[PDB]
Every structure is written in C-alpha cells, then in structure tokens.
Amino acid sequence: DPPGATGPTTSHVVVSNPEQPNGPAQRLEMAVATGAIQSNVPEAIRNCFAVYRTFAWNDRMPAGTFLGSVSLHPNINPYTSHLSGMWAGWGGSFESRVSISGSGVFAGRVVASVIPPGVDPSSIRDPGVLPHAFVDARITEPVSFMIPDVRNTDYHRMDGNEPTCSLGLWVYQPLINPFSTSAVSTCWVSIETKPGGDFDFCLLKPPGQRMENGVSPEGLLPRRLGYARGNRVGGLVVGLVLVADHHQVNRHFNANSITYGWSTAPVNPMAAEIVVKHDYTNNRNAWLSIGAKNKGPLFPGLPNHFPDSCASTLVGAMDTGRHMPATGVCGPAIGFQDNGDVFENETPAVMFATFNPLTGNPIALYDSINPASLAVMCTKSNSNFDSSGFANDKNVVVQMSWEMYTNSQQIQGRVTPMQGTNFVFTSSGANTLALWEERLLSYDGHQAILYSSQMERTSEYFQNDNVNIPPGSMAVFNVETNSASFQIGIREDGYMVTGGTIGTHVVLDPETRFQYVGLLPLTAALAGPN
Amino acid sequence: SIRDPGVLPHAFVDARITEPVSFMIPDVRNTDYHRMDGNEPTCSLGLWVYQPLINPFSTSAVSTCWVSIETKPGGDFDFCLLKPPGQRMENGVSPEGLLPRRLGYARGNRVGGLVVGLVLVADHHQVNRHFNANSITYGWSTAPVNPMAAEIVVKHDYTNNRNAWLSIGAKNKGPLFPGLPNHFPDSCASTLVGAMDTGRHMPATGVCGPAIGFQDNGDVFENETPAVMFATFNPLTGNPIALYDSINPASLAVMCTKSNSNFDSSGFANDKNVVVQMSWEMYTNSQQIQGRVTPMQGTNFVFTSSGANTLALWEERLLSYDGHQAILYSSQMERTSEYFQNDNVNIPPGSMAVFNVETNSASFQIGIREDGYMVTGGTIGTHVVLDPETRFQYVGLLPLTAALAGPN
Amino acid sequence: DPPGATGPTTSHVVVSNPEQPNGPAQRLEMAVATGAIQSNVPEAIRNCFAVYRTFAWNDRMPAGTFLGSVSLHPNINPYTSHLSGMWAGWGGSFESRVSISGSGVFAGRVVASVIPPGVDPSSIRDPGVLPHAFVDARITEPVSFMIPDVRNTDYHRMDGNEPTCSLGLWVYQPLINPFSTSAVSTCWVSIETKPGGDFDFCLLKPPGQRMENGVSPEGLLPRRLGYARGNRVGGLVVGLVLVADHHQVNRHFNANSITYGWSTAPVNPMAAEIVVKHDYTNNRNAWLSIGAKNKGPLFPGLPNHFPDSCASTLVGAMDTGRHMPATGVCGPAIGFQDNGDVFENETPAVMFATFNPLTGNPIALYDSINPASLAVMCTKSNSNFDSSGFANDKNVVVQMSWEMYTNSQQIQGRVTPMQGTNFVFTSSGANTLALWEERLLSYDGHQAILYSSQMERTSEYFQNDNVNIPPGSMAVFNVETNSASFQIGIREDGYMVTGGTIGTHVVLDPETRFQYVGLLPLTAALAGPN
Amino acid sequence: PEQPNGPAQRLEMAVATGAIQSNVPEAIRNCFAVYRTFAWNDRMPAGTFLGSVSLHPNINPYTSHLSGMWAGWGGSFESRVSISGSGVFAGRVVASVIPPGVDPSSIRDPGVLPHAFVDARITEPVSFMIPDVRNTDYHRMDGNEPTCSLGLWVYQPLINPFSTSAVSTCWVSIETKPGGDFDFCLLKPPGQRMENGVSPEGLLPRRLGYARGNRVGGLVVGLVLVADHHQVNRHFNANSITYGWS
Amino acid sequence: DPPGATGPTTSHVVVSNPEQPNGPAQRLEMAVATGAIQSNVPEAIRNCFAVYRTFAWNDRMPAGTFLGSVSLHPNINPYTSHLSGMWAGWGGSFESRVSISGSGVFAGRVVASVIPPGVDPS
C-alpha cells in the first residue's frame, strides 16, 4: 500500500496490556461446552473492518477527558449483529483499528486502554494508571487494538447481561495547534471493528426466536423520530425536558412488561358507561359520572384510557368563571348504546375530571382517581346533556383533544394519582430523569405541552415483549438532532435518563435520529445536552 | 396452471410410504447468479394427486393424510455479494412486511376503522391512501389516517330546507393535490352515495364526526363541538345547494347534523380553521358506502380482477347511527399503505405477493398486486370474518395467472 | 519517475474489496456470446488514464458527505464514451486512479468503496460498512482502484439499464486546515479512468444509432446555457427555483415523446383565426374571440402556441383601471388574410386572456382554457379594431413580449389549466421539483420572470427521439456555475427535480455549464444548491 | 463481422439446463421452409420499413411446432430472401442483420449495417445467418428477450418503366432453417401455457370468413381509421380484463 | 429407490408373449425404406413414462370385463402424439408400465395380453 492509502485487512496491532487471555484455549472451552467446533462467520467479515464510531477531539478538552469507549459485544459490527440472531451464544475477541485525522503540525496524545469487565469506562478518573497505549495526534497509519474476551463462563449467552471488556479513549496530552487561532481546531478519532480471530457463535436458535430474559432493546426507540406520540394523550412529541421526579403511571410499562396503571399502550379514545347524569346549576355545569361494569383491562372499575391529566385538586382548583374545573384535558363526547347506536345529534365538548362522591353541597374536585369518582363535565357554561342520548343506560366515548388552563398552571409533569398510590421516579446522580414533550391543542395562543414518561411505541414494545434491560443497567441511545447530539438511557423502569441540569429543554425535529449503543450501568455518566 | 401432471417427468410417492423421500430442486437459471432483487422465475416442485386416496375401512367420514415438506440448502447453494444488512436494493424491499404476522387491531385506509374481514367484489375505485408497489398514489391523502385539518372559506346559516354548513379548502397546502386537504374522506356524502331527504334536512348517507374550530396559532374554540357530515356540494347552485357527483377543491363542505342549530359566530368565522374526525356513518336509507367511493372530476380509476382470482377488500368497522353494523370496504389496511408509501416494494408487474391466511376455521391465500389491490379465489360476494388472531404468512411471488386457494 | 512527477500508466492499485470477479474468465464469456475474440479498443487508450470528474472537497463538509460515484459505464472514459456510439454491447472493468490536491499540512480521509450492483451509492446510510479503502488528503502518489464488472449476463447491453458496480467516495474524517481562517480551504479530488484489461466492446451498430429504449439523456440540457428559451413563452432562462407543486402542461414532453398539452415544442408565433369581433365599451376595452377551424395539431380548437400564462381568475382579477385584466402577458398582434394580404396599418397591443361565452352582461374572466374561451383584449383605452383589418373572416398572430402585473401577484409558478384538467406534478422525498426562471419584458422597472417546466431544447429533444430514462429513475446533471455546483434530475415525465429548500433561487449566467452524470433512481437524494 | 462461438454457446445451455443432447431432428436442419411473404409496391418511398424477422422458434413452421413442448431454446437460424417480380422493374431492398437491442423500425441507415442488396432483377436468393447473440444461457420460450433480427427496407423505390399507371406489386419471400447449434432446453407438457401468457398468434383467424365484431355481432365488412374510441363492451385486455358488462 | 417411491425410467419388464419381433432389425428395415438412420425422437421422451389412460376397476365388474386396450399408435404417448403432426410415417414398439391403486388388503387379478394385429381386442 502507498503511505496515504489504507486498504481493508490492514492492521498494525499495538499490544496495550501484557495480560491477554489465552484466545485459542477459550475457543477450546467453547467447543467443549457447546460442540461449536466449526466457524460460523464468513471470512469476508473476518477479513475487513467496518466503521463503528467517530469522536471529536478539540483544543478545549483537558487531559483525562473521556473521548469514547467500544464495549465488547456482537452489536458493534453490523454484520455480526445481523448474524447473531440465529445463535444463542457467542465469544471471542474483536479487533479495532483507530484512525486519528490530525495534521502533522498538531500535538497531543490519546490514552487507549483495555478495561476489565465490571469497571465502567466513563467512571475512571485516572486513565494513565491502567496499562495503556499512547496514540499521537500526528499519526498516519491506523492503529489496531485487540479487544479481548475476559469472561467467567465458557461462552456468553446472547441473553447474557454480563460485563465484557471495553476499549476506552482518553485525552492524555491536550490537542494544541501552533497556528494561533482563536477558533477551535478539531481532530477526529474514528474507530473500526472486525470480529477478531477466535470469535465464533455457539448455539442455533431459529432466527428471531425470543430468548429467556428478553428481546434486544434496539426497538425501544425509532430509527428516526417522525410523527411519534407520547403515552399520556397521544400528542406529538416535540422534545425533551429534564425534571427531578415524575409520577406517570398510565401506559408506562417496565422491561418486565408490567404496568402500574389502568390503560393499554396504544392510545385509544375512552369508552365508558354513564352511571349518573347531572343537570347544570347556577354554580357548576352539567356533568356525568363514569364507570365500567368491571370491564377495565387492568383495574376493573377504571376504564381503559382514562386520563391521568384530568382535572383534579392537584392540578388546578375550580373557578367561578366557566363554572367548571379550571385546568384539565377536554374533547368531544359521543354517546352510544350497547349495540353501538350512536346518538348522532350533539357531541358536546367535555372535560375529564375526578370529583368527590361524598359531597352531594356543590360537588368539587378530588385529590386522586377512585373508580367511583370519575366524571366528565360540559365546557359550555349553561347548556345541558340531552335527555335520551345521555341517559343512565347509555355509553360515551371521549377523546383527549385539547387542554384548558384558566390559570398559569399546566399539567406538564403533573399526574393525578390513585387512592393509596405513591409512585415516585427519581434520578440518582450525574444523570437526570428525562421526559418527552407532548403537543396538545390549546384553548389559547400558547403551546400546550405535557411531559410524558415514554412514547407510544416504547410503551407497546415494553408491553408486548420482555425487554432485556437488567436492573443494574440502561439501554443507551445516541440522539442526533440538527445541532445537539447526546445520549439517552432507558432504565428497566421504562424511564429515561440523560445528563444535564434539571430544567434543560431540547427541541426535537422529526428528523431526530436514534441509535442503539448498548447496555451501560446506571452509574455511567451519559453525555447529555449542552 | 398445469392441467396434465403425469406428462412431466415425475416421481411417484405412495401413501403407504415410511421413509421420507428427498428431491433436489435444481437451479435452472439464465444468469450466472440470481439477484436478491431478481424477479426471475425459478424451478418449482409440484405435488399432484396421481391416484386418489382410498381407505378400505368403509367410513362415511373423510380419511385425511398429511404431506409434509422439509428443505435444506443443497450442496452447490451459496450467496454472492456483500451488501450491508438491511440495505435496500434497486427494485424494492421484500413484500413480507405488507401484512402483519397476526391481525390484531389493524385499521383500514379509508376511515381507520377496525378491520373485520374480507369481501369479494367485482370492481372498486378506492384511491385515497392507496399506494402502489412503486410508492405512488392517485389520491390526496397520506397513509397514516389523521383527523382532517382544513380551513373555513364560507360559513352558511341554517335554512328551513337545509342545515347550516361550511365550505372547506386549504390554501394550496394539500400534500398531494394542493386544494384537496389531507384526509378528506372519499366516503363523504355525494350524489353517487345517497341523495338528500326532507327529514334531517341534510344529505342522507355519509360519514360524520365532531368538528373542532381553531385559529392559526392553534387557539381552539373550546365551547361547542358540533356533529358534522362530510359532503361535496355543487358550488354553482346558489337555489337550494345540493349534492355533487364528485370531489372538486371548490366543492368541499361539512354540514351540521342537528336539524335547527347554527355554527357559532366567532369560533367558526371565515378566517378560522376546523379539524374533523371520521367517527360514524349515517345511512337514512338502505344504502351504505361499502364499496362506494366518491371520485374526483375527470377521474375514472377502475380496479378489476381478471379470471380465476377475485378482487378482495377489507371490511372496516365504523360506529353506526343505528343498531346495525357499519362496514366500509377498503382497498388495503393502514400499515400496508404506509409500507407501500415509505418504500418501494419488489412486486413486479406480472406477479403477486402471496400470503397464507390462518383464521380459526378457514385457511386460504391472498395475493397483493403491484397496484396495491388484493386478490383471492371464490365467488363475488363471499364474506370472511377475521378475528384478531388471524395470522398471515408470506409465501412468495406467484404470477397473476395463478389460481389462489380462496375461501370456501 | 521523479517523486513529484507522474506520467501515464503509473498506477498503485489499492484493493478495497478482496472479492474481484475472474476478469479474464468473464472476457472469455463475452467472446462466446458475441464473437468478440479480439480487442475492439485501441491499445493507446488502454495504457493511459484520462480525466473523468473533479470533486471539490472543503472544510465545511462533515463526515459521510457523498463526494461522488464513478458508476461502471463506457461514458466514464472520454475515449471509450466516443467509441460507444459504434457498439451495441460492452463488458469489463475500468481502472480508476484518484489524485487529491492536498498540501502536506492538511488532514482528512475519504472512504473509497466498491458498491455491489443493485445498490444505490447515494442511498447507503453507513458508507464504511462495506469493504473500503481510506485515502488521505496529504497523499502524494495517486491511488488506483479497479472498478469490477459484477454481472449476471455475458455482456452489458448499451441500452440496458441493468445495474453495474460503482466507486463511491464519501468524506470519512473531515478536511481540516491548521492555519485557521474563516475562508474555506478547498481540496480537489480528480478522478481519471483507463479501460482496464478485460474490457471490450461487442456488437457493431451504425454510429449514432438510437437503440431500443431511447437515446442517451446527455443532450437534454446544453453544454453551457447561453441564450436559452423556455417552453411557456420563449424568454431568456434566468435561473432556477424550487417549487412544491406545478401544473405546466404546454409544450411539455415525456421521455416517451408524449405531450398532454396542445402545442409543438419549438415556439412559433400563435397562428389563430378570428371568430367574433368585439368593440370597446366604457367599462372594458375592445376584444377578439379566438378560435381556429379545428386546426390545432393536438387539440383541434385550441390554437397552436397559445400561452398558459394568460390572464385568468386564478392569475388576477380584473381591475377598474385600464379596463382590462390586471395580470397577463401582452404582445403586438398582426392580422393577415388567408392568401397572404396582411393588414398593414394597425398593430394593437394585445393581452392574452380567457373569458366566458355563457355570460353574454359584461363578459368577464374564466378559470380554465376552453376552446370557446380563447380571447384577447387591447391595452389601449378607447381604440377599436378596424373593419376590414380585424373582421370575422380574418386571422391574427401575436408575438409575446410584455408581462403585465397591475398588482403584487405574478404568474411565476402559475399555469392556467383546461376544462376537465387537473394535472399535478410533485416530488416525494430528499428532492424538490425545480423549474426554470424565465424572463419577459416587464411593464415596470422590475424583472418579469415566469417559471417554466422545461426549456425548448429539452422539449425539442424529448419530441424527436425517445430518451433512455426508465420509469424508476432520473437523469442527473451537474451544474457548474461560477460559484455554486449542484445536481438536477430530469424524470421520464420531463420534469426537473433536485435537492434543497423549497423557494431557493439560483442565478444562472450564460456561462453556466451543465454536465451529465448518469441515471439515478427517483429515491436518490440530490446534492442541491447551498 | 463477429459471430458467436456456436458449439460453446451450446455448452452453456447444457450446463444451465442439463440439455446435453439434441432435441431438433436433422431433417429440419436441411430444409428451408417458407416463413413469410412481404408485398412491395410502387407507392412506398425509399426508406420504407418492410418488416423484420426476429429470431425466435416461431419463424420456422417445424420449429414453431416443436416449441410447444419446450420451455427454452437457443441458437442461430439460417435465412434466405428472394424476390418475386419481373425483370423489368427497378428498385433495391436492403436486408441487414440487426444487433439485439436495436429497434428495426428506428434504424435510419440500413446500408451501414451488415447488409445485402436484394434487387428486383435478382435470380438467386440472398442467404443470411441470423446469430443468437444473447446475454443469457438460454431464452425463455415465453420470455420477451431482445434477439437479433433481419429487417427489410425499401432502399430504392420500385418503379415500372412501361406506361402503366396501375400499382405494380413485388413479393419478398423469406425462407428459414434452424442453423446448426439451435436446440431446445426444458420439457413442458405439449401445449402448456407458460407464465406470462399464450402467443398472440391466435388473435386473428387463418382467414376471415363469417367473422363477427364485438358490438352487436354483425358481419365484419372491413376496417376504418378513427382517432379516439370508447368501446368497452366485449373488449378484453391481454390481461383478460374487461371494463364493460358483456 | 426407496420401496414406496418410483422415479422415471423405473421399469420391471414382464414378458406376456415369448415371441417378440426382432426390434433392432425392424429398425434397420425402416431406415432402408425411408432413410431414417438417426433418431427423430428426443431422448428426453425415450427415458420417461408419461400417462396415457386411467381405468376404474370395481367390485361390481365380473370376470372377463374388458378394462381397456392400449393399441399401438403414436397417440398413446402425449409427447409422441404431439410430434406426429410433423411426420408421415412411424414404426417401432412402445413400452407400457401399469400401476394399480390397490391396498394390501384387496384381491383380484387382471389379464394383460398382447393381441396380434388383425384381431379386435373387444
């Protein structure tokens, strides 16, 4: 090869640690444990590299700055991640060439070290203490590193949530430019990846067979954002917020496919029965009591798709204006019989609310959601429900279409709980709980935004399968917007986590792309916004 | 299509056979390899009844035997050319993703109602949200069904003859036809569907839903949300304004269902907007909008089955204004429309993508054309009822002259 | 060779993919099928590289920026492209050396990868997954790549739009200049091409012979713009726009030489006959109903070369000013007799319009173009058409010169349709419908511009031959302007579609050079302006 | 001036199909049979396309008969062209062999191709070889692949020197052999309909007779020429689709 | 072959009459008279059996019930019947395998006899 060009298969292996495991003896261990004597990877994959990451390296990053890591897993090669779906086991080292795109005028060194399993690359504070290699910024040939397979077992389960080795990159000596420019001179560290040598697969399962502890969390987020919808109302996802705590329990599902609420993950309009019809008053509007005849899918008594963004005492108290609760979620109400005979004449605008059943006294808001407390109230101040279509032996289906404030208080992070219910969801440290911004219609010229715990396809994917997110770690995704690229971690609680200050807003266009990285532990610091 | 199976060079297999019998399926090909794109014919292995199955035990019941087929890659089989995994190739994606693995809560492309089953119809005209294998539509709507956002052009007050209504048109902001708003129904009220009656003072048959007025900044008029029928009217009338034959961008309208009410003065002004859903269907006759599609002006799209294969439609489920079941016949379902819309699908113009359909009782075959339309054997008028446990299985590409095992 | 100079034949072949076809065995297969035992290519061409493209590579282009592809075809060597007019088939590989105009101070890499046939190079989302080679910007010796011929068949048809291999170039690590300045430091990637080895031609056709599915799309656009005219009026083409939708049907021809309008592709002046003469009124000027005696060459009744940019209700309402329609394209009218006794005295300034016969009542405007609606008014206030000169048994012909507005609305993307005529033309994704900014003579001191669907030499070229644009593809043209450089794709509908923001204006001087890249599919993303 | 390797294209077919042996009787390879006769008038100017003979089994009546049993073919035919006209007439006809992928009715320079002048005064016929230049290893019997052709054009117009105002017609005949390396590939049952349809030979009868149109069913008189038409009754596509009700 | 499956070309020739003509000597006589020295039949047809008839055989048919005759003609192979539109003469023997769709519980025999020319089988 000429000195400016670099073909495939070309590797200059630098041994960054004189404690490599016996590769072929681990290959013997796999062949004893599974009978995997023959190789399962085509040599077209074993010979050529494939691009995995590229990392920025500025003047303005000091020594010891973590550039990025490459964790050992079959998903860091696209061909190996494709081939892994037919197999129940894997094991073996990878090979990884690093190219640094810096001129011969720069200066600066990168520490590249292989990390033992069970030690987090982002949490290492002293990177030159580990046995490490240096890579100069002036380097021309790409430098290859073996990422060894240090494993307790004879093979890794494809299920297996065990720690593997990583390859970390840190700034050893900062990047400088002799040309005194006030602007930032940027260098690019690209990482490519082979299956190296002793890598093989173990145990034929049929392709796409769901294994024991879940599916891969790659399908939690879309490939690009598009017209994604959140799990509270189904409004359009606008961006992200960083909040301290949150209480969202409707349509929130764990990695164990368990919810704590009463609704199903694809959002539908609320079908419900009419229990007691109420006429309008000089004080308060005409309203209607709601309850299924023990036909709720999760809580029999709570109808499917009742909003937790309804009107309550926790959200906003009633005002002597519109003669109704101030803040809540509204939509039109369609009455229909048991055979589906829709009352087609009127379709009154309607607010979701929880009321105190014990009142009578003018009936006021309740703190929480009780199956005997569910109600819908007219928005029109002096109208009345119709006599035959909204009778006590009828049904109603209501959508969640817009939001009304009648104050300066929205229902952004606010969730109406149930009785005897205290679900709190908190971020620990150097990682913040993140929520999606739904987009409602509003009763004013301002933007109506609710903060939802996850989006609809994340809720359906958690709902329908078990997702292999173990309780110690997160499924981490890269997020590329037009300007900001950052990381999001999804827990096994179903909640989101990313770095930054509580209150940080991100705006996500529908060209926002997500990329599944892998499982990083909860103690890892995610590169957040700003 | 082979009518004489013992004329081909063939093997016999007895019904009394104990060992399984292996056959090589050869690769007779013109080319040096098959493209993974490639829609070229390969060899097949057919099975025909040579001598009929008999039981010496004289039972009136049917004695059934099972012929199971297993498959290796045999010998000289190999793959050729590394593309990256999941790379879309030249003439499309595989049509495996046209239908779901199990039915579930699937929705059709006309209103978005629940898919109940299949019908066999002679012809159909459905052009909204229908996309080809070439990812081309002929209509004006986008494949995920959304509520119709539209402008208010002219507000009309109620009359002793006819209800209060409202004229519709986007300011050249339609995604496909600028002038036709996204998600206007082709199941609207028209002269082709049902003429007006001097009962409800409105068109008889159509699709209705509530109407939400809102401003340009999104300021929703939250007070009233009147029930509303989608209709196309003749703009030239005035004379009491009556139904039109087709859909013209100056003909679009929505009319109150309530017989003597009136649109509000400020929320439904001429500088406002409205968003309406398609929630239920009204008849006011014995004529539904099952296979009926309101066309456009100068538009004649006909979709016909040829022979020994019948055009098939999905049965949507609407809410109804009565105690009967409201069913519209839609050309495809929503995820089929989105999958045709977003990718090119490798269905060549001579063939079909064939699927096995397992319900509780009936298992049959469905062929999807490159037109996006469905095809299966049987008599015109055959109804199938599909529970949400109905499973689909992609078989492959069979030509249009193939006879699909239909229902019954 | 001295280390700074490179002669011909000098190549350092870098292998990017270790799976080349058996070159001399495919050459034997071509000779069995066609009898091409000996070489049909002169050996002066096989020994020397000749230039094909030159790609600009900047600081301001990120990683994964597609620089360009070299698709395998005879038109990528200038000698082989000339020879391919004689031959009906070909087969074999080309050899491609790449030279980068980078100093020794710069840094940056490009990915060179050979792409399998059937895969669009401009649809590859991760460029480095395939087996690739890295070429550095600081390289001195040029690097040679073999572009293999992976093919099902024994040879390629010179017609056949069957896919061949490509050599795509992407930016891997961006180009950086350490001498930091806001100015863009441009690098030049120049690609040269040999016929490599097993390349040959197959079957003699006569030179310049149109083959079965059309001529090449090279002659659609000129080599350089010049004084080019559009097909709406025939005015000077100023530049481009990017419009969402358009309706231009007149003189527009498909790749199958099929038109949907009523005119012929070189714009002649509008030969027309006079049906009913009309005098001037105090409210509106004099006018003249137009209709031939069923002598339109496409729609007999619509006259040859009647404008679509006439005055209509969609264009502009009539004002109580000059007693005529506000916005239209005007011209001087010439009245002549059937044998050639042209009327010499008067020549009225005459605006094109469309009116209503059913009115009777002052006759007003009309929405569309009906063969009874064809009518033109004066520009003067109280003049009148002469008795013998402009009678009911005479003719009239008008040369379109003006463009009047009389409001703030123009006829830019506006086309007047026919009755029973709703044609739309729309792009779908990563690509925007482009149009040609025409030029007329404004009635003001502003610039009077129409947007036309295609130009005359594109309309004439689609007429006289069929053009090899298959229905799933585009014909892509490089646009070498003074400042900008981008791509324009022409469809089989005859419409221009390119990348960029809807509404982007481009100024095209007559030194704008158009250069033909090959055929790309409709789903391909085009590098548009800015 | 390039012919394919005849017996080595035959090795490609025996690999791709298993057709190692011959399937055409050798009495057909020795007998020219009249395929088609073209009328050639005074009233056709220079450059008039007379008709092309595309390479297929249907251009020999013995080979079109044999091809009902076979799903594939490949190989060259041998053709000769003869004129039946008086020795007084003046006019040439170019007959040129056309490479595959070129439309014969789009060729504007027939005398540049490998050609032959077939004058009206000719006595012996002009023999041609029509090669099988193909990308593939065989041809599908139903497949509409590009083949080599044999076009005919009026190079010089046919004129009658005597004072005769009537139209004088000349007759161009084409005879055909299967040449040499021609063979068949894949047994289908005899008369088996292949995938994309039957041949269009059976659209019109061998002679008109008492034929009936599809609007009412009256006796067919002859043709007309109309610009546009709307007939939808009893009109069926090649895809066997009608839009009417009868 | 496995004992339940039968491919093409599989034949167990049972002789019903031990007075066959000299087959290859009659083939030489045909080539003197007509010049048919080489084979006019493709060898794909000579190797495989193709179906001609199917005869129902019941409990309710007594002994001596005529099931059917296979008279020697080109129209008793479907490929040879198609080829015989090209030819004005023929000669030679055909080979006929017979398969009976009987279970192992049934019983019954058929007579197969080759009949001299000039004698009606019925």
Residue numbers in the entry:
A (entry chain C), C (entry chain B): 21 to 380, 385 to 554
B (entry chain C): 143 to 380, 385 to 554
D (entry chain A): 38 to 283
E (entry chain B): 21 to 142
What does the article say, verbatim?
Sapovirus (SaV) belongs to the *Caliciviridae* family and is well known to cause acute gastroenteritis in humans as well as animals. The major capsid protein VP1 is solely responsible for most capsid-related functions, such as assembly, host interactions, and immunogenicity. The calicivirus virions have a mostly conserved capsid shell, which is composed of 180 copies of VP1 arranged in a T=3 icosahedral symmetry. Each VP1 capsid monomer contains two principal domains, shell (S) and protrusion (P) domains, with an N-terminal arm located inside the capsid shell.
Here, we determined the capsid structure of a HuSaV virus-like particle (HuSaV-VLP) at 2.9 Å resolution by single particle cryo-electron microscopy (cryo-EM), and successfully built an atomic model of the capsid. The cryo-EM map clearly shows a T=3 icosahedral symmetry with 90 protrusions, composed of 180 copies of the VP1 protein in total, distributed along the icosahedral 2-fold axes (C/C dimers) and quasi 2-fold axes (A/B dimers) on the surface ([Fig fig1] and S2A). The cryo-EM map allowed atomic modeling of residues 38–554 for subunit A, residues 21–554 for subunit B, and residues 21–554 for subunit C, except for one disordered loop (residues 380–384) for all subunits ([Fig fig2]). The icosahedrally independent A/B and C/C dimers show slightly different conformations, mainly between S-domains in each dimer, which are the bent and flat conformations, respectively, as in other T=3 viruses. In addition, N-terminal regions of residues 21–37 in the B- and C-subunits extend underneath the capsid shell and interact with the neighboring subunits around icosahedral 3-fold axes ([Fig fig3]), although the N-terminal region is disordered in the A-subunit, and no N-terminal network is observed around icosahedral 5-fold axes. Therefore, the N-terminal network around the icosahedral 3-fold axes likely stabilized the hexameric units in the capsid. The P domain is further divided into two subdomains, P1 (233–281 and residues 444–554) and P2 (residues 282–443) subdomains. Unexpectedly, in addition to the residues in the P2 subdomain, the residues in the P1 subdomain are involved in the interaction between the P domains ([Fig fig6]). The βB’-α4 loop (residues 465–469) in the P1 subdomain and the βC”-βD” loop in the P2 subdomain are mainly involved in the interaction between the P domains. In particular, residues 294–306 in βA”-βB”, 337–347 in βB”-βC”, 375–388 in βD”-βE” (including a disordered region, 380–384), and 403–417 in βE”-βF” show significant sequence variabilities between the HuSaVs, which are designated as hypervariable region 1 (HVR1), HVR2, HVR3, and HVR4, respectively ([Fig fig4]).
